[PDB]
Design a protein around this ligand. Sequence first.
Ligand code: CLA
Ligand code: CLA
Ligand code: CLA
Ligand code: CLA
Ligand code: CLA
Ligand SMILES: CC(/C=C/C=C(C)/C=C/[C@@]12O[C@]1(C)C[C@@H](O)CC2(C)C)=C\C=C\C=C(C)\C=C\C=C(C)\C=C\[C@@]12O[C@]1(C)C[C@@H](O)CC2(C)C
Lengths: 210, 230, 213, 217, 165, 41
Amino acid sequence: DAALPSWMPGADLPGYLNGTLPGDFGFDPLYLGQDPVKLKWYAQAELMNARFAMLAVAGILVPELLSNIGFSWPGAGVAWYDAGKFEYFAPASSLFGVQMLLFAWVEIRRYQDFVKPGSANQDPIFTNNKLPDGNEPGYPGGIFDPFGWSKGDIKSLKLKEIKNGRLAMLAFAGFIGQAYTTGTTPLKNLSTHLADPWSTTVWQNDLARL
Amino acid sequence: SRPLWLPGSTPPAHLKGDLPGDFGFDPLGLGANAESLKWFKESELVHSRWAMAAVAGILVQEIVRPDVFWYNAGKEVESPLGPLGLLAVEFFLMHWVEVRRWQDLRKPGSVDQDPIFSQYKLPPHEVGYPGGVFAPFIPGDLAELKVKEIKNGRLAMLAFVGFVMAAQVTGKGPIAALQEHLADPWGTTIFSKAAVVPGQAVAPPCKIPASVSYKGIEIPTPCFLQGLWP
Amino acid sequence: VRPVWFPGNPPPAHLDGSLAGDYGFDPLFLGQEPQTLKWYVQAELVHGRFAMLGAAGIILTSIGAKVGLGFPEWYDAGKVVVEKNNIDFPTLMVIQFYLMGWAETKRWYDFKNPGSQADGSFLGFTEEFKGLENGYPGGRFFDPMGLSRGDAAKYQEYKQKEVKNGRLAMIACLGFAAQYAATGKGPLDNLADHLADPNHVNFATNGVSIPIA
Amino acid sequence: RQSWLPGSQIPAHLDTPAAQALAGNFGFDPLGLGKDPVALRWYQQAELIHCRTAMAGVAGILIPGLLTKAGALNVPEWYDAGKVAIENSFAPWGSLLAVQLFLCGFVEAKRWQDIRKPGSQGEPGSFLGFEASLKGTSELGYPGGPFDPLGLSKEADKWADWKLKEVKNGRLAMLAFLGFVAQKYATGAGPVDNLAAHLKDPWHVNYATNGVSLPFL
Amino acid sequence: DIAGLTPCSESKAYAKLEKKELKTLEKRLKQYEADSAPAVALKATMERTKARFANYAKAGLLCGNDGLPHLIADPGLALKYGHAGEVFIPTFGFLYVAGYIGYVGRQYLIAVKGEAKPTDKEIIIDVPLATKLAWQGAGWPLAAVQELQRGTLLEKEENITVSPR
Amino acid sequence: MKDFTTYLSTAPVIATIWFTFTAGLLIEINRYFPDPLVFSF
Ligand code: CLA
Ligand code: CLA
Ligand code: CLA
Ligand code: CLA
Ligand code: CLA
Ligand SMILES: CC(/C=C/C=C(C)/C=C/[C@@]12O[C@]1(C)C[C@@H](O)CC2(C)C)=C\C=C\C=C(C)\C=C\C=C(C)\C=C\[C@@]12O[C@]1(C)C[C@@H](O)CC2(C)C
C-alpha cells in the first residue's frame, strides 16, 4: 500500500485496492473485491447503486421538503412508501412494462460498454452521433456530460461522486429502516429528532417500541 | 540497587527497573512476556488515570454536594439530556478516543496526526504518554513525573476500591466513612464489623439495596462479592 | 531422586519425570503406550480443569447459600435455573453440545494433527489455535496474559500447580458427590456440621459410609 | 486446502488432480464412496443433477412461499400444491406422470448416453441438425450450448467460481429440501411458517422442543 | 379383505384374546396388595399388553378367525392395501444390515490379505481397521454396485476346482 | 499394555464384546419400543 487515505489510520490495508478506483480508502474487511474480476464488477455495481440511490434520496426528500414547505402537487403529502398505491394516468402495470423495456435497452447498452469498452459509443440510427472515444465503463461522457465537465477536475469529481453516492446509499438504507421501524416519513423523523434529540435516539425509540 | 516492594527480595528477571514505578513487583509473572507487558503498562496507566480522576471526583463531589451519595449519584442527577442521550454521546466519544488510543497501542507510529486539521499532530512519543497537545506545561523532569503519576495512580486505584468496599459495607462516602472511623477508631474497622471463626461467620450486611428503580426499570445493584465478605 | 506416590517403589519407565504432576502412579500401566499417554494427559488436564471450575462454582454457590444469599445448592441449581428463568432444558443442552462439540472437535483434531487448526480455516485465526504443547494450547486466546511465554520455570511451576489443583478438585468433586449421596445436604453444610462437632460428625457417623456401625 | 474437517486426513482419492478439479472438493468422503474414479465421475454427475433439481425445487417452494406470506401470491404449501394443482388441471396425475416420464426419460437417456461416452450425442444425423449443439463441453455435467444462453461459461476467469457457486448453493438446497421434509413431518406447518415460529421464540421453538426429534429430551 | 382376513380392529376374536390375556394378568394381580412389587410388575405388564394390542390394531394388521395378526409377504398386495411395513419394508431394512455385515467382513478380509500373516489378523482382530470399515460400510449398496460394475467383486477362474472340473 | 489390548482384540474377546453390544442394543430397543411386530412408526 501507500500513504493514501484509509478507513482506519494505521490499519494494514489489503493492497489490491491501490487508489485506481474512486473512493479507495481500503475498506474491504470481508475481502469481497479480492479477485480483480469481482472488483471490476463491484466498481460498476457501486457506481450504479450509488447513482440510483442519490436520485432516490433526492426524489424522497425534495418532495417531502416541497410538501412541508407548502407547495402544491397532486402527489404532495403522499409518502415515498405510499406512492405506488397512488393513482396516475396509467396503472403501475404499464409503467413497469415500459420501464423494463426502456431499461432493458439502456442497461444492455451499458453492459455492452462494460463487456467491450468502446462499443456502445454510437447510435443505432444517427451514426453522426457518437460518444467520445477513450471513456471508461461507468463514465460514458459526451451527451452524458453536456455541461462541459471532465476536462480537468475528474479525480476530484469521481471521489465526490462516490462519496455522495455512498452517503445516499446509506440514506436510503436509513429510509427503509426508519419507515419500517418508525412507520413515518424520513424528514418527519428528522423533525422529531430535532424536537428533543435526547429522548428520540434509535436506542430510545426501539426500547420504547418493544 | 533500586527501591523494591520487598527491601530484601530479588526482582524478576523481566523487571529491570527501566519502567516508571518498576519496584520489582510481579510475583505471578504476568508481565514476563514482552508483548503482554506493553498492554499491561498501558492498562496500568489508564486505570491509574481513570481512578485518580474518579477518586478526586468522588471526594470533590462529597465536599461540594454532601447531599448525594456517590454510589447513588447515577440515579439522582436527573439531567435534561435523559439517560440514553448521554449514554449515546458517551458511547460514541469514548469509542472514538479509545479506538484512537488502541490504534496507538498496536501500531505506535500510526496515530499522531489530526484527522481534520492536518497541520497539527503529536510529536513522536512513547505509548501511554501521548504528549503534544495533551501535555502543556510539564513541570520538571519527565521521568520523576511519570513515577509520581503511576504512584499516585496505584494509590488512587486502591482508593477507589476502598471507596467501593467502604460504601457497600458502611453505605457512606469516603470522607463520611473517614469521619466515622475518626469518631470510633477501634469499632469502625472492618475487623470490628466482621469476623469468621471455625464455627461461625459474621459478615457486614450491605447498606446498598439489591435493586433501584431509575425510571421504570429495576437496575440490579448487587454487593460486589458478598458471601466472600468476612 | 524424585518424589513417588509410594516411597521406595521405583517409578515405571514410561513415567519419566517430564509431565506435570509425575509421581510414578500407574499401577495398572494404563499409560504405558506413549500416544495413549498423551491422550490420557490431555484427558487428565481437561478433567482437572472442568473439576476446578466445578469445585470453585460449588464452593462459591455453597458459600452464598450458607450466608443467606439467593443461591440453591449444587444439586438443585439446574432445576432452579431452568425454572426461575423459563429455559427449555433440551434447547440449553443442544446449544451446549453444539458449542462444546465445536470446541472439543477442534481439540480432538489438534491432538490427531497438532499442525492443524492453525491454517486460518476457522475465521482466519492461525496462531491462536496452533497449540504449544499437548494439553497446553496457549496463544493469545487460551493464554491471553502470556504466562506460558516469558519465564519458563514459572511455566513449569504453573503446570505443576495446575495438574495438582486439578487432581485435588477432582477428588473434591467426587467428595461433593459422595457427601450428597451420604449426608443429603450441601458441601459447606457438611463442613459446618464437621466444624461444630469434629468428633461424632464425620463419615464414620452417617451409617452410610461404614455399615458396621 | 479448504477441508471440511481442518485436521482430518483427506482421502487420497479426493486429493488427486482428477478430483481437485471437481467443484466443491472439501475432502468429504468419510464412507469412501468415490474411491473408484469412475464411481466418482458418476457420483459427481449425480451430485450436479441432484443439486440443480433441488435448487429449482427449493426455489419453487420457498420463493412462492415467501411471496404468499407477503401477499404477492396464494400458492398453497408445497405438501398441498399437488392436490390443489391437480384439482384445477386438465389431466389426471397419472397421465401427467406418464407424459412427464416419457419427456424426462428421453432427455435423461440422452444425458445418460453422453455420460457413457462424452460428446456422443453430436453424432451427425441423430437429431435434425440440433445434435450439433448436443456435444456438451470438455467438462461432463456442464453441457453448455443451448443450455447456456447468456454465455457465462465462455470466460475461463469466472468458471471455477461459477462451478463452486452452483455446487454450494445446490448442496445447501438439497439440505433445504431434506429440511422441508423433516420439518413437515415434525411440525405440520410450512417452511416459512417454521422460520417465523423460530424467529418469534427461538429458545423454545426448535427441533429440541418438538416431540419428534429428541424423544429422550 | 385380502385373503378372507379381517382387520384386527374389526375382529372380535382379537378383542377376545386381549380381554383373555388381561383376565389372566388380573387374576394374577388379585393375589397381591395394592402397590406391591408384583402388583407394579403386573400393572406394567397389563399396560404393555393393552398398548401392544392397540398398536397392532392401529398398524392396519389383518387378523384371521383366531384373532391373530397375519402378515402379507407379497409386494403388490402389501403395497396396494398398506401392509408394506409387515414384510416388505423390513425386507430391505434387513438386507441393508446384512449386506453391511457381509461387506464389512469382506473389506476386512481383503485388507488383511496383504499382511505377512493374514491368519493372525483374523484370530486377533485389527480393531482400528475393523472399526474404520464398520463405519464406512454404511454405503455398502453403492460401493457393492460400483464394485460389481468394475468386474472386481468377482474373482475370475483362479478359484480352485476338483479334477472333474 | 500393548499385549493386554492385543488379547482383548482376540476373536473370542472381540466376539463377546460385540455380541454383548448387539444384544444390549436389541434389548434396549425392545425395552423402549416393546413388541415391534411391524414397521409402522
Ligand atoms: C438447509 C438448512 C436449514 C435451515 C436454515 C433450517 C432452519 C430451521 N429448521 Mg430445519 N432441517 C434441516 C435444514 C435446515 N433447517 C435439515 C437438513 C433437517 C433434517 C435433519 C432439518 C430438520 C428440522 C426439524 C426436525 C426441525 C427443523 C426446524 C428448523 C427451525 C429451527 C432450527 C432447529 O430446530 O434446528 C434445525 C435442526 C437441525 C437438525 C439442524 C440441521 C441444519 C443443517 C445441518 C444445515 C444448516 C447448518 C448451517 C451450517 C448453518 C445455517 C445455514 C443457514 C444460514 C442457511 C429453522 C427455521 C424446527 C422447526 O420447524 O422449528 C420451528 C424443527 O422442528 N429442522
Ligand atoms: C429368523 C427368524 C426370526 C424372525 C424373522 C424374527 C423376527 C422378530 N422377532 Mg423373533 N425370535 C426368533 C427368530 C426370529 N424372530 C428366535 C429364534 C427367537 C428365540 C431366541 C425369537 C424370540 C423373540 C422374542 C422373545 C421376541 C422376538 C421379537 C421379534 C421381532 C423383533 C422386532 C425388533 O426387535 O425390532 C427392532 C427394530 C429395528 C429397526 C432394529 C434393526 C437393527 C438396526 C438397529 C437398524 C439399523 C439402524 C441404523 C442404520 C444403525 C446406525 C448405526 C448404529 C450403531 C447407531 C420380529 C418380528 C420381539 C417381538 O416383539 O416380536 C413381535 C420379541 O419380543 N423374537
Ligand atoms: C445516512 C445516514 C443517516 C442519517 C443522517 C440518519 C439520521 C437519523 N436516523 Mg437513521 N438510519 C440509517 C442512516 C441514517 N440515519 C441507516 C443506514 C439505518 C439502518 C440501520 C437507520 C435506521 C434508523 C432507525 C431505526 C432510527 C433512525 C433514526 C434516526 C434519527 C435519530 C438518530 C438516531 O436515533 O440514531 C440512528 C443512527 C443510526 C442508525 C446509525 C447510522 C449511522 C450512519 C450509517 C452513518 C452516519 C454518517 C456520519 C458518520 C454521521 C452523520 C454525518 C452527516 C449526515 C451530518 C436521525 C434523523 C431514529 C429516528 O427515527 O429518530 C426519530 C430511529 O428510530 N435511523
Ligand atoms: C490452579 C489452577 C490453574 C493453574 C495454576 C493453571 C496454570 C496454567 N494454565 Mg490452566 N486452567 C485452569 C486452571 C489453572 N491453570 C482451569 C480451571 C481452566 C479451565 C478454564 C484452565 C484452562 C487452561 C487452558 C485452556 C490453557 C491453560 C494454560 C495454563 C498455563 C498458562 C496460564 C497460567 O500461568 O495460569 C496461571 C494460573 C493462575 C495464576 C491461577 C489464577 C487464579 C484464579 C483467577 C482464581 C480464581 C478463580 C475464579 C473463582 C473462577 C474463574 C472462572 C474462569 C471461567 C475465569 C499454566 C500452566 C494455557 C497454557 O498451557 O498455555 C500454553 C492454556 O492454553 N489452562
Ligand atoms: C478433597 C478432599 C476432601 C475434603 C477436604 C473432605 C472433607 C470432608 N468430608 Mg468428604 N469426601 C471426599 C473428599 C474430601 N472430603 C471424597 C473423595 C469422598 C469419597 C470417598 C468423600 C466422602 C465423604 C463422605 C461420605 C462424608 C464426607 C465428610 C466430610 C467431612 C468430614 C470428614 C469425613 O467424614 O471424612 C471423609 C474423608 C475422606 C473421605 C478422605 C478425604 C479424601 C481422600 C484423602 C482421597 C484419597 C484419594 C487417593 C489419593 C487415591 C484414590 C485411589 C486409591 C484407592 C488407589 C469433611 C467436611 C462427611 C460429612 O459430610 O461430614 C459431616 C461424610 O459423611 N466425605
Ligand atoms: C433433488 C432434491 C429435491 C428436489 C425437489 C423437488 C423436485 C421439489 C419439487 C416440489 O416441491 C416443489 C418444487 C413443488 C411441490 O408442490 C411439488 C414438489 C414436486 C414436491 C433433493 C435432493 C436431496 C438430497 C440430499 C439431501 C442428499 C444428501 C446427501 C448427503 C448428506 C450425503 C452425504 C454423504 O454422501 C456424502 C456426500 C459423502 C459420504 O462419504 C458421506 C455421506 C454422509 C454418506
